């Protein structure tokens, strides 16, 4: 049994050019589970920005969307480096159980508004 990850904060406000750091919390991270960092697409679907561990075969991967595992074992920083106005949107994270019939659980969605 496992619980879905949590995404913080619910509303993040950053100035254009600064880094915008969310936090995905998930305590099952292991060889059984993987993490995803999503932003909602124009089709109202979750568009995968990044993953933990790094999805190196994702076509068009942008290293500007950075995921870092924190020492406490539960938290993961998910940062937009050098954030632009067009980076404003709705963000979330997911946890995927890899065992056959991989199951996905999403966090609640947070809002990033890039200003100035």
């Amino acid at each position, epitope marked *: 049994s496992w619980n879905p990850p949590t995404f913080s904060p619910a509303l993040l406000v950053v100035t254009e050019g600064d880094n915008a750091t969310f936090t995905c919390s998930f305590s099952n991270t*292991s*060889e059984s589970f*993987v993490l*995803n960092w999503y932003r909602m*697409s124009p*089709s109202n*679907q979750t*568009d*995968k920005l990044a*993953a933990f*561990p790094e*999805d*190196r*075969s*994702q*076509p*068009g*991967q942008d290293s500007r969307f950075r995921v870092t595992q924190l020492p406490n074992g539960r938290d993961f920083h998910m940062s937009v480096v050098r954030a632009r106005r067009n980076d404003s949107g709705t963000y979330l994270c*997911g946890a*995927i159980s*890899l*065992a*056959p*019939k*991989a199951q*996905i659980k999403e966090s609640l969605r947070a809002e990033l508004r890039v200003t100035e």
Partner: antibody
Amino acid sequence: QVQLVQSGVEVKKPGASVKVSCKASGYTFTNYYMYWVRQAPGQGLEWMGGINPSNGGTNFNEKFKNRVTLTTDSSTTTAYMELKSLQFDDTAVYYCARRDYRFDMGFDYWGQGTTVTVSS
Amino acid sequence: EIVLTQSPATLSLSPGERATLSCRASKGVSTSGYSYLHWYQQKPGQAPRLLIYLASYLESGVPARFSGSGSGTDFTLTISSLEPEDFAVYYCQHSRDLPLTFGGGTKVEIK
């Protein structure tokens, strides 16, 4: 339910170009990245490239970086591979294969293959 | 660039025998407890089929007589009891980094 049906056999001359299609059906077309891998006579399997259908992002094997163009159409759920300046070593069977966008859990479905022959 | 080496090149076996196939990577393909190594089956003239993903997970719909094991640079595919439909070429593939490469294949033949 899940299918990937590729275009038909291609017979080309050196220097020509070929465009192979891959019609996907039975699933959310943007939930899976699409990749292209070929298998030549006397050679093994060779990864050519990949495309993210949601944003059009691509990655490539450096051997094909400047000769392959990958495109997608979500309204028809079709992936396209265009290979220009064909040479003799391009004779092969060309496959499209999908991968879960969430994580790499293998190429869990392959197209049937498209034979492309380069001959004089 | 990671090179995958499959041994043996050919296994001539009868139905009911157990097949074990080796895939050795020139560099490690495991990090954080995940092994980026998949096993496919291809019969000649037909499309490949995913058998094992992440080196130990059985793809849904694939019979349980197939299993994957290993980590780092050493990996094995086991067919616990060979059936007639299992005579085919078997390939490993890594995704630790780009470019993605495949192994040379191991042909499981009937003797």
